[PDB]
Amino acid sequence: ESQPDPMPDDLHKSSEFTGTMGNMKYLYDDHYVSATKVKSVDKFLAHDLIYNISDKKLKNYDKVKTELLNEDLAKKYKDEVVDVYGSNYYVNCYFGKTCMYGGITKHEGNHFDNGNLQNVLVRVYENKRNTISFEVQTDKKSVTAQELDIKARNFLINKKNLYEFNSSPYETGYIKFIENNGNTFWYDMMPAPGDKFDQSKYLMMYNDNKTVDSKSVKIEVHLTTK
Numbered sequence: 001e002s003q004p005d006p007m008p009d010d011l012h013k014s015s016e017f018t019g020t021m022g023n024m025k026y027l028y029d030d031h032y033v034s035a036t037k038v039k040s041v042d043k044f045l046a047h048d049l050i051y052n053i054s055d056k057k058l059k060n061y062d063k064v065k066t067e068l069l070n071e072d073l074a075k076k077y078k079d080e081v082v083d084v085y086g087s088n089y090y091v092n093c094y095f096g097k098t099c100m101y102g103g104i105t106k107h108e109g110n111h112f113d114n115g116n117l118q119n120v121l122v123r124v125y126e127n128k129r130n131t132i133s134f135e136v137q138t139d140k141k142s143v144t145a146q147e148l149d150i151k152a153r154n155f156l157i158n159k160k161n162l163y164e165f166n167s168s169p170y171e172t173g174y175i176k177f178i179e180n181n182g183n184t185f186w187y188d189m190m191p192a193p194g195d196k197f198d199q200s201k202y203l204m205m206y207n208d209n210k211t212v213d214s215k216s217v218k219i220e221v222h223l224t225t226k
């Protein structure tokens, strides 16, 4: 059922991407859509949903379209009261508007009990050594892996310069989720080889709206230096 771990050539190398890393940095550096108790208002394609969500911050949008893996996922959350969490983009976002993928969890029943926040531990591995470990927080029992990944990359951009404008001090990176039923999966942290980064295509991995149990999930960040 599990994703086999990275083989050595499954991982994007940053020295083979000659476009602008600030373009990856932007997707994770104090960057996210957040909405709570929202119900979808519209649809573009069969596998997406559109919500009246404004960024209260720098006022860039009052409508978020989220794209899912398929029509069934879309149908399923269409008339549900939901919280949204995800990384938005504007390039080739077509439908005051912004785009994203997945980020969707039902609101009813999905929160801890004394309004507590749950800590999820991230263990960071640099050239196969556990050098730093940190906690990220959510208030959702079933939280998207996108949410947690966003929060862990945000922290790593600050502490570790994970992504910089021109480069990354890292060659390879992957984030790995280990669920308490043994299931593992992982995302490639580095952009595809070449001179142009396509945010929309990068983010599209979050399509499947994967959620995990926040209280028992384990996250590992595996990085290798230049």
Ligand SMILES: [Zn+2]
Binding pocket: 036, 037, 082, 083, 106, 107, 108, 110, 111
């Ligand atoms: Zn909620």
